[PDB]
Write a protein that binds this ligand. Structure first.
Ligand SMILES: CC(=O)N[C@H]1[C@H](O[C@@H]2[C@@H](O[C@@H]3O[C@H](CO)[C@@H](O[C@@H]4O[C@H](CO)[C@H](O)[C@H](O)[C@H]4O)[C@H](O)[C@H]3NC(C)=O)[C@@H](O)[C@@H](CO)O[C@H]2O)O[C@H](CO)[C@@H](O[C@@H]2O[C@H](CO)[C@H](O)[C@H](O)[C@H]2O)[C@@H]1O
Ligand SMILES: CC(=O)N[C@H]1[C@H](O[C@@H]2[C@@H](O[C@@H]3O[C@H](CO)[C@@H](O[C@@H]4O[C@H](CO)[C@H](O)[C@H](O)[C@H]4O)[C@H](O)[C@H]3NC(C)=O)[C@@H](O)[C@@H](CO)O[C@H]2O)O[C@H](CO)[C@@H](O[C@@H]2O[C@H](CO)[C@H](O)[C@H](O)[C@H]2O)[C@@H]1O
Ligand SMILES: CC(=O)N[C@H]1[C@H](O[C@@H]2[C@@H](O[C@@H]3O[C@H](CO)[C@@H](O[C@@H]4O[C@H](CO)[C@H](O)[C@H](O)[C@H]4O)[C@H](O)[C@H]3NC(C)=O)[C@@H](O)[C@@H](CO)O[C@H]2O)O[C@H](CO)[C@@H](O[C@@H]2O[C@H](CO)[C@H](O)[C@H](O)[C@H]2O)[C@@H]1O
Ligand SMILES: CC(=O)N[C@H]1[C@H](O[C@@H]2[C@@H](O[C@@H]3O[C@H](CO)[C@@H](O[C@@H]4O[C@H](CO)[C@H](O)[C@H](O)[C@H]4O)[C@H](O)[C@H]3NC(C)=O)[C@@H](O)[C@@H](CO)O[C@H]2O)O[C@H](CO)[C@@H](O[C@@H]2O[C@H](CO)[C@H](O)[C@H](O)[C@H]2O)[C@@H]1O
Ligand SMILES: *[C@@H]1O[C@H](CO)[C@@H](O[C@@H]2O[C@H](CO)[C@@H](O)[C@H](O)[C@H]2NC(C)=O)[C@H](O)[C@H]1NC(C)=O
Ligand SMILES: *[C@@H]1O[C@H](CO)[C@@H](O[C@@H]2O[C@H](CO)[C@@H](O)[C@H](O)[C@H]2NC(C)=O)[C@H](O)[C@H]1NC(C)=O
Ligand SMILES: *[C@@H]1O[C@H](CO)[C@@H](O[C@@H]2O[C@H](CO)[C@@H](O)[C@H](O)[C@H]2NC(C)=O)[C@H](O)[C@H]1NC(C)=O
Ligand SMILES: *[C@@H]1O[C@H](CO)[C@@H](O[C@@H]2O[C@H](CO)[C@@H](O)[C@H](O)[C@H]2NC(C)=O)[C@H](O)[C@H]1NC(C)=O
Ligand SMILES: [Ca+2]
Ligand SMILES: [Ca+2]
Ligand SMILES: [Ca+2]
Ligand SMILES: [Ca+2]
Ligand SMILES: [Mn+2]
Ligand SMILES: [Mn+2]
Ligand SMILES: [Mn+2]
Ligand SMILES: [Mn+2]
Lengths: 241, 241, 241, 241
């Protein structure tokens, strides 16, 4: 089997194994700051991508990879009543570039069909296509999630996320936990990677502040990822990676 | 650090690394059948325990272990309207023996304070101390869960469970997923192992059928476990173990 | 190609080409009354099925049928503030029988995985798994719709519905129109019949009144259906059938 | 009853049953290209008309026809931010000729009252009389739609449209679906053909590129039509025609 994995308890400035786009920068304090601040600046868009391409599925053997990703993130909203727009974990073509900001989370464009992009969003603003209240959603080539669930978020608190994909069942699972609040949310749905993503892809984060309002800033504090493409043990990744 | 882990996609009869109690037996088909059947027989109680003792916390260093466990289980109810009693994953003293059946899931006794037993239950019957509807609960030395959440169960379908404990935050998280139903449930709460469990313990399963009604049978199909006691990477355990 | 179709501007009592289940009866006025009245009686469940089995897909050739169905229905709610539960158009195994009432619309059962049943619902009551406000949803083997959209309903007014399935794109489309209100709603999503339904099935309607409240009654006034299983022209069905 | 209908999965060059006006031509690939390209050329106007006149309503009997039309179309915009002007399906007097281009979609003229022309537009540019954002509208003798609704369009994707008219209710319904996006839009309103169209008319398409900008090109890929003038079954037309 073909496998890859990595784990960081923090980020380091100028680290050559990461690609930054938009307003994203890593602070000296080891934080991946996706949006500009001075309080969030409106219309800010930043994305970060793990430099090395991941082999998601193979056209020959036809086998698809299973993977797991976890990270700690937080947002700061100067006004918890006017939140916007959100954060997303995504997989996309190797040459992926930033797209439309605000409600499109920098992954899609209005009037166009999305590229081969798959993502798990943490949406804070209700756009026309959205359900009411902040939510977690699974996006498959569209900003219009195929499924969502309410997200009990907390301003300034660290959220711990775990995203897992089981190739055997094609099931994608996303769970979010707030240790300090002992609160938790989970979502799951089947996704077919063979028809929604190219064989090789890059993974990363994308976040956007309000279009005309500060909304909230987004910071990723740590990141862990493991993938196994067959010719798995998640308990070892949640306790290991 | 001190570490231990194991992973099985199935069970084998007479396997010397497991301790069976009650009516529990492993079929030739590789299934850990916890309750007697002929349809579930009432008042049946079976438990299985991983033979090797786990070092959960150390009195000297004072450090506590982090761990992860996953398994696939299912129940069969000849009548989905009269379910009883449930299944539980637990940690207990090395010399742990079966206790009261039915509503006590074989872990506790009426009129007595529970031993140093910590468990995650999948409760199908509403006893006096229970909330309404099947649920997932975190039990700490008591059959009366410190916290619970509704469990959208499905008869005869395989449920995939992931239980994780983070020593740094003392947070215990339990999630259950039904691939075929794309349905999911999650629960979390802080638990202090130092004051609710001895340094060394054994882990296993316990299930009970109705006291005077068949209720449902319980079968565990696979099992995976990893523990790390410091002087972790879960992504590697969900994809590895 | 294998084809079948039928069209009725009204129902006739004792018509031998229809199967009635539950409280469903056809009035002398030519109406298919699915629920008992005296104002709707609580806990009423009725279903009607076209007697002849439809060949939906073929295991050999692997081809799947395209079909179209239209009908006029209405509900009467003595109190438009307490509506429950809804109406559904469905396809199911030939020997399909009524299931759980109320929120389950007589198609599914609590604690069990749905049979091979596909349906388009017109939901008036918000159950735990439902989104807010009356809606139209596409159910695939589950009472939990894979997709929904708000339904601007009107008490006592006749709604004209058109459901179409295109085998070439696997897309299921449902549209509802209120001539008198010049109001309209539409929904669409892909559904794979090969994996959610048996080769042969029966089609019909199912409606349920509130569990403990009258809710509203449901009457189907006309019905039209056409199917084409390849080794289509919908314009001819909306103007013909 | 008097009836007529036709159905094409593609167009053939020089086909004698169609009338082309403006820049409209049919490619060798079977596409009805309404606008000149080289990317769309600004100020381009093309129209196509089914050669045979349709009997819409009869002055004697006073009866009005019911009809259904469907087609697949697409537009290509080199810049999805500067779209213009749109496409329309229309009914007009037998001797109908092209009118003003750009925002008038070649159907109307500035400073003049429209002839007896009825149309369903797919408007991409906001003119003074328009609502904001691309939309679908019902035009009755005027470029100023009597009703509209937002149109979630996608560049380069094939849209499947279904327009139906019910003489019994005088209701005109237009629905548009994007299979690849599982997205859908619908609109409806009453229209009185007797007072807005002559007894006999010709039907066709009309599209216009931006006045001073390329905007987008418009191609119709297939076309189906059925009409019934009484002294209907649409399910047969969506699955048949
Ligand atoms: C952003 C923008 O261009 N606004 C112009 C505004 O546009 C009207 C529409 O309103 C805007 O719609 C946006 C949806 O795309 C919405 O963005 C959302 O923002 C939230 C954060 O609040 C969040 O990020 C979300 O994800 C975003 O989608 C905007 O909030 C919203 N703007 C407002 C003020 O509500 C919409 O109403 C539409 C419906 O018909 O009409 C559009 O016109 O239009 C105004 C004027 O009408 C325009 O303001 C003018 O700008 C000029 C310069 O461009 C001059 O400065 C002029 O003085 C000023 O009035 C906005 O620029
Ligand atoms: C189990 C038992 O001993 N029942 C005797 C019964 O006891 C009365 C109490 O009823 C029982 O309460 C149990 C709670 O501990 C309950 O168990 C639950 O069972 C469900 C499955 O259904 C599930 O597993 C759950 O987790 C369990 O807790 C029993 O279901 C319930 N039994 C019934 C029939 O409801 C309770 O009502 C209490 C309140 O005051 O009174 C107790 O007396 O009492 C009956 C007689 O009253 C006794 O039956 C007699 O048994 C004799 C032999 O022992 C003779 O056979 C006699 O003919 C017969 O009537 C039950 O044995
Ligand atoms: C229906 C029923 O059995 N109700 C008993 C009630 O149950 C509690 C639960 O409440 C009920 O939950 C139903 C969900 O399955 C809900 O049904 C929905 O009804 C609406 C129409 O309103 C719609 O159709 C929808 O689709 C349905 O799902 C009921 O409306 C709801 N009932 C009420 C009154 O709100 C729920 O609250 C649950 C949470 O813990 O607890 C259940 O216990 O429980 C009461 C007593 O608690 C019971 O009433 C008793 O019945 C006895 C006979 O069985 C005696 O008559 C006794 O005097 C009486 O109090 C209901 O029968
Ligand atoms: C098209 C035209 O004749 N433009 C002359 C321009 O006219 C002024 C008006 O502006 C134009 O208004 C059009 C509305 O009918 C608008 O058309 C829309 O185009 C979009 C695509 O972008 C879409 O198709 C939509 O459906 C159409 O309706 C034009 O876009 C718009 N043109 C511009 C540049 O914005 C309008 O502003 C009006 C308000 O008072 O004033 C009119 O004058 O006027 C300019 C000069 O003012 C003229 O340009 C001159 O042309 C001369 C030759 O005729 C010479 O070349 C000279 O050098 C040049 O400046 C435009 O021809
Ligand atoms: C989520 O990850 C972040 C990043 O490692 C953790 O925050 C760091 O925790 C250490 C504790 O050893 C502190 O010294 C650092 O200052 C923290 N970094 C930042 C940027 O705050 C955090 O503990 C993790 N949270 C959870 C719940 O696991
Ligand atoms: C949960 O674990 C069980 C046990 O391994 C899995 O069931 C086995 O799946 C294999 C597929 O390779 C079958 O050949 C065996 O017959 C199954 N065993 C039994 C006892 O049924 C199951 O696939 C796992 N489920 C999920 C969702 O991962
Ligand atoms: C929907 O179908 C019903 C059933 O045919 C139509 O209602 C009948 O309309 C005729 C008109 O010729 C009346 O004479 C009957 O009394 C009606 N039947 C009933 C039970 O009311 C109705 O017109 C159709 N509605 C639409 C919008 O097409
Ligand atoms: C809409 O109609 C067009 C025209 O027939 C369809 O496109 C053709 O589809 C066939 C598939 O058998 C291809 O071989 C042709 O190359 C296509 N023609 C063109 C010009 O592209 C299209 O499939 C239809 N779309 C939907 C959703 O029904
Ligand atoms: Ca949003
Ligand atoms: Ca219990
Ligand atoms: Ca409901
Ligand atoms: Ca316009
Ligand atoms: Mn969203
Ligand atoms: Mn319990
Ligand atoms: Mn519903
Ligand atoms: Mn317009």
């Amino acid at each position: 089997a073909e496998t890859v994995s990595f784990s960081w308890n923090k980020f380091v400035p100028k680290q050559p194994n990461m690609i930054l786009q938009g307003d994203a920068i890593v602070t000296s304090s080891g934080k991946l700051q996706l949006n500009k601040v001075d309080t969030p600046k409106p219309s800010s868009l930043g994305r970060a991508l793990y430099s090395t391409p991941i082999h998601i599925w193979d056209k020959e053997t036809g086998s698809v990879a299973s993977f797991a990703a976890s990270f700690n993130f937080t947002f700061y909203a100067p006004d918890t009543k006017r939140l916007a727009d959100g954060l997303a974990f995504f997989l996309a073509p190797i040459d992926t570039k930033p797209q439309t900001h605000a409600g499109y989370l920098g992954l899609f464009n209005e009037n166009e069909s999305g590229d081969q992009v798959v993502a798990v969003e943490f949406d804070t603003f209700r756009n026309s296509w959205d359900p009411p209240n902040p939510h977690i959603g699974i996006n498959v080539n569209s900003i219009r999630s195929i499924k969502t669930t309410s997200w009990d978020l907390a301003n300034n608190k660290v959220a711990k996320v775990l995203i897992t994909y089981d190739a055997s069942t094609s099931l994608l699972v996303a769970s979010l936990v707030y240790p300090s609040q002992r609160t938790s949310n989970i979502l799951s749905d089947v996704v077919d990677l063979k028809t929604s993503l190219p064989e090789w892809v890059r993974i990363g984060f994308s976040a956007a502040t309000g279009l005309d309002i500060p909304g909230e800033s987004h910071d990723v504090l740590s990141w862990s990822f493991a993938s196994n493409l067959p010719h798995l043990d998640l308990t070892s990744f949640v306790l290991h990676e």
